[model samples]
Target chain A: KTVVVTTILESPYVMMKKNHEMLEGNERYEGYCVDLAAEIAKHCGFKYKLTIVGDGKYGARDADTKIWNGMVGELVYGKADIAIAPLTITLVREEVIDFSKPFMSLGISIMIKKGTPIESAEDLSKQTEIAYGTLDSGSTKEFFRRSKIAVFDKMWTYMRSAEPSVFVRTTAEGVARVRKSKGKYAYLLESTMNEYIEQRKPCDTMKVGGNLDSKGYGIATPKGSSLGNAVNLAVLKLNEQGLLDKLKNKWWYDKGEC
Target chain B: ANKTVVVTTILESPYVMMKKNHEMLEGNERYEGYCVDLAAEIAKHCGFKYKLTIVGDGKYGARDADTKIWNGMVGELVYGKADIAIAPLTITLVREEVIDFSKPFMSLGISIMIKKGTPIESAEDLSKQTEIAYGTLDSGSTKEFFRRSKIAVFDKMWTYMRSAEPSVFVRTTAEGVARVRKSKGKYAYLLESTMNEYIEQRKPCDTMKVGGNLDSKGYGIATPKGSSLGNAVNLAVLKLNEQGLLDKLKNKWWYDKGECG
Candidate 1:
């Protein structure tokens, strides 16, 4: 079977090459996950096709309809055979999907515009000079909403009631707001993406504070799919062979602008 | 549907312990600790009645190389002797092939433990010298880590450990910690950071955890491969983790009444 791999177009994971108009199929895309997908398939010895998730979402379930969205929706609905993206390995997702062992580790972190006085989540929580927020419908936001910890709960209360709705629809919008808001905006996002944006040309933003929590990202397949077992072992094999680190460095730092 | 699930676990300080009045108490009430409390929560959440039993072999689980037979709590699951395992069991690839694991409820890594002022600060420090010997609990993930490592320092450490003159491996975590306490500055113990931290806070707190963790891993709840309870139990673990119950339990057992002031 030519596996249908559903992924997102978030950088530096999957991106359209500069000359994409002249290229065709998978050749049009390039980045860390693109390289990773190549390596995973080569090891698993399977032919596959890459497709961007139609909704351009990471994945979450709607409360009323109880339906999933993003790459997770595709897999749960059997519209895709695999999901190779930065999709987090979360509890509800795991109930419907089978994840391989983690191929990458990350955690929620802070992104501050250069010269912002914020040094930690606590700093942002107790102050009103700067407005802070998270990606709407994302894990970082869920973390705050679900957290019973004092500091995070206080921060959540501030973010949820802020007049401007301190929640953005996408990471790009979050980063954009930080860049344009002078030092008045701080974005709460994953360490990976926050670090990635920190390196781009403007360099007007920086990730502050240690990660708030720790977790991993895994290659996912529909529940009980035959490919789940093979993909898992393949990831473990590649990780042990030192390829994961090499690929990470190649995309995150080697191609860095700053 | 009313079957009492047979849950197998191991006895390690702060994870599982026989109650002070075991003769007076009966059933699950005869034991109490982190895992015992966790079992109660998971059972209540998943809506099942379970009987907690200590593993017969007194081991955290390992595969016998020659016979290829598994032993300890893992063996109990693989051989169909238990419905689930709630312990300080480390999730591993080999074991995952035969049993399923919930997403980790706790995170820990290999850490160094030394008597106060041992002049040892890290795994590399212990590896570079023979004056102070180092060892790991036999048949557990720590030994397997050194044995299977491709990194130069760990590979070298494993080489020395396998053929050390007195056999550096210990049978249990308690025995290993005892060796550290009694060996003067002559020995160091390699153990998980969670246990090391607990030991550091006990009454006779002469040992302290040093250096960064060697690797990252977690303790997981294990069930037989394809067990029906896997879904609910795994979900409950994540819910508990997210709800801060896991952290509360850790503090309750590890630091609520720490003896070291």
Candidate 2:
């Protein structure tokens, strides 16, 4: 019996083919996460199917909306056995699901349009000239919310009560907003995604200063899944064999044009 | 007078060295390099006087192949032989044992050096040949490169280096370079790229740096476990790095004005 693993459609991780429908699932699969899932299956002795999360949200338990969405939601609701995406492992998420040892390391960062006046994280809180937002209900937003640091906590207050519902639904939308709005809007996301975005065409966005917070990305599985042990072992074996670093250099350094 | 702060040092150019006039200079003036300046600043900040002591052996990690004594800068702090190590010690897994390292003060990588007439131009070229044997300083960071790698490309290179005729080994980078120059295309040295570049501008210019660096790792100041001076020293290094003084000292010592033009 095959298990179902759910993931999101992030570039270099789980991008769908431009002509995906014509291709089979295995053939259609691309990106770092797809390859990682295959490696996991190879090591864990399991057959699995990769499916995109039905809802577009990257998985969060919405406090006000009372709903689950994205890959994390699918795992929590018993829709999949595992999740292999560029999902940030946060303390709150750890309470609900078990995560394999980090497959990738990254930190929270702010991506601003080129020529933006803001040069540092502290500038985000001190200035009102530009509007800053994070993906709604995602780790980026949660990082700001839970931060005890002065500037980040202050930025969180502004974010929570912004008039236009400043939260974005996805990173792509956030990038689009930053591009169209000139330097007026800034998106806070993971440094990996921010660095990835900086490489694409036009390359209008750039990660400013160093990371605001440190965190890692993990291969998440539903709590108490029998495959969890195997998955963790596979990750370690991959680490020892330099496969994890290989994937990182392949996706993050070499192929992450998008 | 404040307590004497012990420092770990290596014989890397422009960093730490014993000079002919060594006895005239005190512990603080033992070596002349960017690291020494940064260490001086850190000592001033922490209100301490320090004695710069050279590590007995030149490996960065805390292993003793012969007597099992702690040999590297990390080893000095770990075994409580030194209170702090302000040397060019790369932060790695083995050294992280029993010692706390400050923020990286500088960055460098393991590089290969070959005699000018050597047929090898890159690391890949070195792997295929049997006559031109290559190796790194035993127990040093370059040797660790062959020891820890598991990737096919690197593994192949390691296999070739290990199984080659005469075992392809050396005990020091200086010895390896000397062999390379003397043997004429028969030996190559793998060492930190910074030192390789520095030696290239020296008198002979017969040896040249070959291939890209194996990996990019940073050097950090290490201290004994629970030493209060760690944070202050780290902060001082960061400050010096930002001010560009560290870069100036590095260039002054490592780079020479070649008369090539």
Candidate 3:
């Protein structure tokens, strides 16, 4: 069967090439996840089509509607056969889908303009001079929303009710906001993406402090899908052979502008 | 105060070491290093007496998953067998849930220890290649960090170390270091940056600490949760940091003696 792979248009993961207008089909995209999807398909013996998620979200459950959204929603609703993106494997998401062993690991990290006074989460929570937020509907947001740790919970309360919404809709917007805030704002995001951006030009943003929580992104399949086992094994094989590391170096460092 | 505070410590060098003249001394005088000096300073400031007792299990402290019990200095505090812990004991989130930690007395992180000429430079280098084997102290925070980390590289390293034939893990830092020295670049020891740096400056000086540390954390004076001693000890540590005593003590122990030179 031809696999319908759903993904997101996140930088260095799944992106249209500069000359995408002149290309056709999967040939139009190139990125870490783009390369990864091809590798997984080749190893699993499946022909696939890459389609971007209509709603640009990582995936979260709406409390009011009791429905999933984003790339996860596409999989749960059978709109796609696979999710080949930087979709995190959270406990809640696992109930509705199957994720292969994490293909990439990341944690919630702080993104600050260079020379910001902040050094750690405690430093951020103690001061009112600077503000911080996470991607509006991602794991980082959910982490603050559900954290029991005193410092994290305190941060969440402040961000949840701030005069202007602290949350941003995308990583790009958060990075942009931090660049323009003149050190008055900080962004919290996945470390992998943060580090990737740090290597890009203007090169003024930095990933400060250690990650707040550790999790990984996995290649997800619909719950109980037959592709689950094969996809999982393929990921493990790639990880063992150092293909994953090679891919990361290729996307994040080899092409790094800084 | 009349009551003697029982200070739980480990015999790790440059943190708590048996003095060369230990046999001629008694009580707290028998030990030396950054912690021993800090303990003395804290006692002077807080107006209390203390006795340094080495942990029986010789562990830095980690909760066993199957037994649901803590071992090492943390266990001593949890069971009310000790009044305080002042060693190179890391202030971890798990330990904090069951005990109270003073403000950090010293900061450190998980660092890679390798022989001077080893090709490995960072954790990424080691993770990408399996030519050189690596391991952490069998029952300490460093080991637990890898075991518990979901970070892909660390988790992958843990998987390789956990099931390797002939076993990569060592019971003590000394054993891990010896393996690094003897293996001739075949093994690397994952340990706290403080101990790794200390060893790098010791006699022979065959081992070198490479790459940035994996996790950032600090060592704190530990007390049972809600203990009256906690506040005074915490204040004493803060004062020491403010007065530059911590930096002074670290320089005295780690850099003052340069056998390698």
Rank by TM-score, highest first: 1, 3, 2
Answer with 1 or 3, whichever has the higher lDDT.
1
What tens-digit string does per-residue lDDT give for candidate 2 at B29-107? 6567656776777777678877877778665665766887666667667778888877777665455545766545665
Given candidate 3, what's the lDDT at residue B194?
91
Q: Provide the TM-score for each candidate, comma-separated.
A: 0.87, 0.56, 0.57
lDDT of 1: 0.88
A best-first ranking of the candidates according to their DockQ comes to 1, 2, 3
lDDT tens per residue, model 1, B1-261? 468899998888899999889999998988989999999999999999999999998876778989999999999999999999999987766788789888788877889999888998888898899899999988667887798888677888999999898978898888899999999978899989999999999968889899977776668899998899998988898788767788789989999968887
lDDT (10s digit) by residue, model 3, range A1-258:
889999999889989999999999999999999999999999999999999998877688899999999888999998999999988765567667877756776778999999789988989998778999998875678778877668989999999988688889877899999999999999999899899999999999999898776556889999779897678768756764557877988999999999
Model 3, B27-136: lDDT tens digits are: 88888888888889988998888899999988767788899998999999999999999988766556776887765677666899999899998998898878898888
After superposing all C-alphas onto the true structure, candidate 3 shows an RMSD in angstroms of: 13.8
Best by lDDT: 1
Q: Model 3 clash pairs? A: none
lDDT: which is higher, 1 or 2?
Answer: 1
lDDT of 2 by residue, A92-134 (tens): 5665787765666566788999999988788888886799899
For model 3 chain B, give the 10-residue run with minimal summed lDDT. B238-247
For candidate 3, report its TM-score. Answer: 0.57
Q: In model 3, which runs have C-alpha deviations exceeding 4 angstroms?
A: B1-111, B114-174, B177-209, B212-261
TM-score of chain B of each: 0.96, 0.87, 0.95
